[PDB]
Amino acid sequence: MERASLIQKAKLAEQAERYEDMAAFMKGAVEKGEELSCEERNLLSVAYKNVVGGQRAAWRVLSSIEQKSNEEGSEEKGPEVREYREKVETELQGVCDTVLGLLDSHLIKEAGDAESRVFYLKMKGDYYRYLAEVATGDDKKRIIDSARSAYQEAMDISKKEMPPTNPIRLGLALNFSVFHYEIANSPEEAISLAKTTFDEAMADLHTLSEDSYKDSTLIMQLLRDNLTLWT
């Protein structure tokens, strides 16, 4: 289909809360090989985040039941939970692999501006992080190395090109700190990054308009909330 029709249908799917359809429409739009506007970038992200978010939530529920049943839940367990967790896991890996394919085949290379590049490299780190949440063995190590490398490149660019209160820069740092804490088991690095990010942004909040402040502090509050949990 023409790109404009795919975008129109993505926007309709969004209004209809049809996020699988929305993601498929945006995938087709991306595959035309032209850059995305900020609006379109957000359509892509919203769609796939909703899809993978439901799969992640399902995986966590199932994995938890599976562990509490491998904790002496003996005779209260056939293979059903494991089989269903594996099913949801394979489906989640597929969606993450699809997004990463779009990022590596089109979006990162074709991005003509630093803000877009940071946005997509952050997405690359995020979807590798979701893969890492379910990975085992050699897959897990590869995935964790790839997440770190994407997040780090995004961080370098954002420190060069974006002010410390920029919401994209803040959300990147937030998600990289979650990667440190939950994925890499580097809680020193996580707490350090979250606190430094908060402090360097605080320092600028007095120059911000009402609207800028709302965007920035939304993210800063989450940094604060994580520091609570992590300390």
Partner: peptide, 8 residues
């Protein structure tokens, strides 16, 4: 379950 960047 830490908090990550919200999606809007």
């Amino acid at each position: 379950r830490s908090y990550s960047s919200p999606d809007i």
